[model samples]
Target: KAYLVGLYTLTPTHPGSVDQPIQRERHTGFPVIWGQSLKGVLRSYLKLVEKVDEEKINKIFGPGLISVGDAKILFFPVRSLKGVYAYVTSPLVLNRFKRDLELAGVFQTEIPELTDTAIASEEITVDNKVILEEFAILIQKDDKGILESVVKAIEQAFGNEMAEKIKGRIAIIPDDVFRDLVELSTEIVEEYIPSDTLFYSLILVTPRAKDNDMALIKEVLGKINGKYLQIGGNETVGKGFVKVTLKEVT
Candidate 1:
């Protein structure tokens, strides 16, 4: 089982000179020296520490909320994971804390790169109800006709699979495109089969940079829609990339 963590920076509204009483007060511990900006605090912290755990959190502020300038820190643990448990939170005062962890290189993986690619692609489109129903029937049969049609659709819209040697290259379509695909897929399943309502989750994985084959993963995801969770680079292994997995809701 693997896990992911991240940190971000927050800014203060007021300003003060270095060594001054107000500056001295904020500068102690995680210093906010005169002329230093909020982003600087984050960077400095990142330089000092890399991984954070329950003990670190307790030592920082005695188990209660800690304040930094005008910002506050909050933590959250996400649930319902199958393979890995993901913990995330909006970076506030905790930005500096999380950065310290990254700098220390403590996490199993570095923070994942989050982008808007999924919201920006044009290849994904909605199909009419009739076409959706027809496709669903074909898929439910698990027949050669349905499989052939799916292959043709992927080739026509995303190019031939043979063109690429990776598995997730076509799976990481943008949020909208992915959603469109899911919608179409769901409709087919619902209309053709009498099974219970199915639930789904998507996990998009990309290979390490050394593997040039995964370069187009972001573009693939650009064609879909959903929650995009970025994992640390350390989480990935080898050169072959892995993209989003469509898991049946169980």
Candidate 2:
């Protein structure tokens, strides 16, 4: 079985070393959480709780029985003119996300075409234009319910209260503009991925695994899904805490 796990940052997450800066994808240069680190975090969390035994931990995570993919960005926070910040995403980002969703058989709607213009809620725009971090781009008042689904998807991880606050602040910018914003406009507290940032990762269980092994994998991951788990660096200062929501990709 395969699952999709959503990680919504609750605080500044430092998925990098002390002085090295945030980890980024080689091609897109977008911030990322390495699969190795994600797996280590999950293993350590289970072990620290002292509920799941060492033997079961080794079995579930051992060799190739179950594995997690790197965490990729889904929504990024950018400074907005009307509100404090707006959740920004690009067509390119949506395409990649849709691909991952289908990989786990997760349901997703079509991504509409975009060029120089952007899609934003009415409250976040003035004169049908969204001004974000000194960049003003024409905005569309209506979208094909894509934003609604996105809001609900976020609600699944962070709950309706948080989702409601961001409902009118979503923005879909152009790919070029989005690339620059994610690359140059991110916060610089050791270049951490900002709080409220959303990320997704895929969890896979080996096809040849025994029925018992599959059950164990499901059980262990189920415990942590839809709960808050701390990962990455700066535990003492309350950094790297993320809200997780897991969904079977059926």
Candidate 3:
């Protein structure tokens, strides 16, 4: 079975400004102001989905015990869009629900088909229970310069004002270790996977004294979340810093 996902955009408008006339075009999806809350939008969308069909809820959404009486909403923040978007992964029910959303003009476009090949598969055992398969966006080929440019674009999109602050925090390390990190991360991705292929952000950690000084390594591994365990070694490199590399999976 294949799941369906929809992508929509809600561009908030500035009141009483010249931009107001152009703002109407922005209203193509939902009229959400910049500073306004997302509660109303989410509530309205959920109600629309429920009204479509409650029986196929299990097939439409992932594994979760959500009672009809209680509205369990999960929100994942997407920095690229600079706002939060809703996600419902139910292959069986999503088609109908998506149709309703389209009819109501709440959705910008038709739902996208998500296949198992589209899903990212990572195998890093943690606590011997949960496995992590992160979904990432693919911007371009696996080149250092291209990756850096994409990262800059994402920063500008979401972290415009704070882009400088975040950029300052980015640390560059040795080329050899960086290459190893990339190779290891790529290996974690299953062969013939047709998922989004974009490089995520790289994480560099600093170790503390009296605690093996390898906290950054541990933290990076933990963040991998049983996706893939890739590290150059325990040896210190690049003026006392540990590096964790990431790529986009679009």
Candidate 4:
């Protein structure tokens, strides 16, 4: 079986549950999309753009039969003293990534327990340096070669160039700092998240699924992956614009 793994970036806010608008992670105050919401959107996108049959949709993404997990925040882009913007992750995020890798049942090296000061891997210069907007503290990673296996996996999963770039940008920050940043940078009631901010989703496939399943999946993605699907609220002015990609296939 394979997983549909990809990077999702925001492109939201309506007060969500009196805490923040847009459903945020309880712990991190980060926005999250439910598994059901993800499945519904993808299924509808397939039906509209790919013209997937109702039965096939049921077979592939049944509400009861298929299992999907909510897509959560993996990285948040902050103004970088380095370049454009640095996609910042926290030790909390990395720790979650470690558990998710276990759930996904694959990866390079096991994610290590990081101190407040540890950066995931040493990432100085990526394939090319990027300057993200806004105010981000200048941060650097350690090149302990810890994520080499995952780097190789990501390189193969995406492409050599993108993998190199992504490998360079992955970072780790303190949990409290990350949480504070999410709260500080976001506009909840206004429903706005800065563009280019990145997120990720996880998909679970059955062991008995076949090539046909993968084929249909890719075919649907080919149609809608980069079409800039709007997620939360606001248009005309252009608020929420998110695109999905086929990140890993195995």
State which candidate has the highest TM-score.
2
Q: Note the clash tally of each candidate.
A: 35, 0, 23, 17
Model 4 RMSD vs true structure:
4.9
Local accuracy by lDDT, each model? 0.23, 0.81, 0.23, 0.58
Predicted structure 1: lDDT: 0.23
lDDT of 4 at 116: 45
Ranking by TM-score: 2, 4, 3, 1
Which residue segments of model 4 deviate by more than 4 Å?
A: 10-20, 110-143, 147-153, 156-168, 187-189, 206-228, 247-249
Q: What is the TM-score of each candidate against the true structure?
A: 0.15, 0.91, 0.17, 0.73
Which portions of model 1 show Cα errors greater than 4 Å? 1-144, 162-231, 235-250
When summed lDDT is taken over every stretch of 10 residues in candidate 3, the lowest stretch is 67-76
Model 3 CA deviation exceeding 4 Å by range: 1-60, 64-151, 156-158, 178-250
lDDT for 248 (candidate 4): 42
Where does the lowest 10-residue lDDT sum fall in candidate 2? 153-162
**Winner on lDDT (1 vs 4):** 4
**lDDT: the better of candidates 2 and 4:** 2
lDDT of 1 at 31: 17
115-225: candidate 2 lDDT, tens digit per residue? 889988776787868889989989765647878887776675446766786798899898888888888986676667789898889998888988888788888888777
Cα error of candidate 2 at position 46, Å: 1.1
TM-score of 3: 0.17
Candidate that beats the other on TM-score, 2 or 4, i.e. the better one: 2
Task: Sort all candidates by lDDT, best to worst.
Answer: 2, 4, 1, 3
